[PDB]
C-alpha cells in the first residue's frame, strides 16, 4: 500500500539548534547541553533540551517538591516507616482533609494542618508556573493564548480547592491527596448531592469534552491526509494559500455542507477545549450552595423520565428458575 506517514523511514542528524533570540537576550538564562534520542525520532523530533531557567520556574519546582515530600513523608509515617508496606499500600494511602468540626479555623497537625500547608505550597507552585508561561510569551513577542488556556483549567482547580470550601464555610470540603481516595471523593460527592448527571453544567462540560476529542481526531486525520501537499506547514499555508488547504476545505464542504480555513479551525479547537473546565467549575460552584438535590431539581423542572414497569426480580423470574433447579 501507499506510505501512511506514521513512522519516519530514514532519520538525519545535524548540529543542535540553540534557539532564536532578540534584544531581550533569552540566551543568558538558557542552559548548555543537548541530547538526541533515536527512539523518539521515529515519531517526532530527536533533540532534547535545552530549557529556560527563570525565577518563576525555580520557585515552582522547589515549592512543588516541598508539597510532594510532605505528602510522601506523611504517607510513609502513617504506615510505621515500613518500606515493604509503603510499597504494598501505595495506591491506598492519602493525606486527608481536615474534619468538619473545625470549620474554617486552622486544625491541628494530626487532623489537617499538614494538609493546609501542602495545599498552600501547591497553590504557590501553580501560580508561579502560570506566571512563567505568561512571561515567556511576553519575551518572545507572541500572543498570550497559552496563558489563557492554562487559566481556564486553573479556574476549575481553584473552584474545586479554594472557592467552594470558603463559600461552604469548611476546609473539609476539599479533595484528599491520593490515587483511590480521590476517586472515592468523586463518587461520594456525586452520591451526596443527588445525581450529577442531572446537573446541566456537567452535561455541558461532557458535551465540550466529547467535542474536543472528536475535533482532534478529525484534525489529525485531515492533516495527515493532505501531508503529501506539504499540509503540515500550516503557517505558510495561512500566509500563502496552497492546494492542501483547498483540498482539506473541500473535503469537509462536500461531506457536511460547511468547512473552515487553515487558521479558523484552531480557533474552534481552542474554544472547545477551554469551554470544558469553565462550565465544570460553574456547575460545581452551584452544588450545595444553591441546589442540594439535582434529581429533585430535574423533577421540578420537568425533564426527569418516568417508567411504567415494576421493580424486583420476582416480577420477571423466579429464584429457583435463575439457579436452574
Amino acid at each position: 500500500p501507499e506510505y501512511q506517514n506514521i513512522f519516519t523511514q530514514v532519520q538525519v542528524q545535524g548540529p543542535a539548534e540553540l534557539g532564536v533570540d532578540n534584544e531581550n537576550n533569552l540566551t543568558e538564562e538558557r542552559t548548555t547541553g543537548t541530547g538526541f534520542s533515536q527512539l523518539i525520532g521515529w515519531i517526532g523530533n530527536a533533540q532534547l533540551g535545552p530549557i529556560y531557567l527563570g525565577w518563576f520556574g525555580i520557585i515552582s519546582l522547589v515549592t512543588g517538591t516541598l508539597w510532594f515530600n510532605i505528602v510522601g513523608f506523611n504517607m510513609l509515617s502513617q504506615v510505621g516507616y515500613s518500606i515493604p508496606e509503603f510499597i504494598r499500600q501505595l495506591f491506598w494511602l492519602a493525606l486527608e482533609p481536615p474534619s468538619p468540626e473545625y470549620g474554617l479555623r486552622m486544625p491541628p497537625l494530626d487532623d489537617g494542618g499538614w494538609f493546609i500547608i501542602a495545599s498552600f505550597f501547591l497553590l504557590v507552585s501553580v501560580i508561579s508556573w502560570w506566571l512563567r508561561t505568561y512571561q515567556l510569551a511576553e519575551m518572545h513577542k507572541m500572543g498570550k493564548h497559552v496563558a489563557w488556556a492554562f487559566a481556564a483549567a486553573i479556574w476549575l482547580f481553584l473552584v474545586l480547592g479554594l472557592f467552594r470550601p470558603i463559600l461552604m464555610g469548611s476546609w473539609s470540603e476539599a479533595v484528599p491527596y491520593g490515587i483511590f481516595p480521590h476517586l472515592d471523593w468523586t463518587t461520594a460527592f456525586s452520591i451526596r448531592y443527588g445525581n450529577l448527571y442531572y446537573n446541566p453544567f456537567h452535561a455541558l462540560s461532557i458535551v465540550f469534552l466529547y467535542g474536543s476529542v472528536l475535533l482532534f481526531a478529525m484534525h489529525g486525520a485531515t492533516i495527515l491526509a493532505v501531508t503529501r501537499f506539504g499540509g503540515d506547514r500550516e503557517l505558510e499555508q495561512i500566509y500563502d494559500r496552497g492546494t492542501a488547504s483547498e483540498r482539506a476545505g473541500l473535503f469537509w464542504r462536500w461531506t457536511m455542507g460547511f468547512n473552515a480555513t487553515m487558521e479558523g479551525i484552531h480557533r474552534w479547537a481552542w474554544w472547545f477545549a477551554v469551554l470544558t473546565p469553565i462550565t465544570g467549575g460553574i456547575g460545581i460552584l452551584l452544588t450545595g450552595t444553591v441546589v442540594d438535590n439535582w434529581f429533585l431539581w430535574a423533577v421540578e423542572h420537568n425533564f426527569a423520565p418516568d417508567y411504567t414497569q415494576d421493580y424486583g426480580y420476582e416480577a420477571y423470574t423466579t429464584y429457583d428458575g435463575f439457579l436452574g433447579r
Binding site: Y307, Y313, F322, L323, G324
Partner: protein
C-alpha cells in the same frame, strides 16, 4: 432498558452450597409424643429449658444435632464448663430469632 440486572456465570450457578449435603446427612424426623411419655427431667439431671422434652427428643437433639453442628463432641456433659452455659443461652436466642423475627 434501565440497565438493572445481576450477571452470573453459568458454571457457577450449577454449583450448590457445599454445606447443604452435610446438613441433610445429620438431620432426622421428629418423634410424636405419646400418652404419658417419660420426660428427660425424670431420667437425668439437666437444665430447665431442656427438661420438659421427651427422652427420644433429647436424644436426637442433643447428640445427633448439636454435638455435630457445632463440632464439640462433649457438649452439655459437664454443667460447669463455659461451653454448656453458652449453649443454653444460644438455644433461647435461636428460639427468639425463629419466633419474634418471622
Amino acid at each position: 432498558g434501565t440497565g438493572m440486572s445481576v450477571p452470573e456465570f453459568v458454571s457457577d450457578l450449577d454449583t450448590p452450597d457445599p454445606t447443604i449435603e452435610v446438613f441433610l446427612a445429620s438431620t432426622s424426623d421428629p418423634v410424636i409424643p405419646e400418652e404419658g411419655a417419660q420426660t428427660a427431667g425424670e431420667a437425668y439431671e439437666n437444665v430447665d429449658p431442656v427438661l420438659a422434652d421427651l427422652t427420644v427428643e433429647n436424644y436426637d437433639r442433643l447428640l445427633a444435632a448439636m454435638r455435630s453442628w457445632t463440632g464439640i463432641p462433649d457438649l452439655l456433659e459437664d454443667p460447669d464448663h463455659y461451653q454448656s452455659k453458652v449453649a443454653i443461652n444460644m438455644i433461647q436466642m435461636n428460639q427468639t430469632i425463629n419466633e419474634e423475627w418471622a
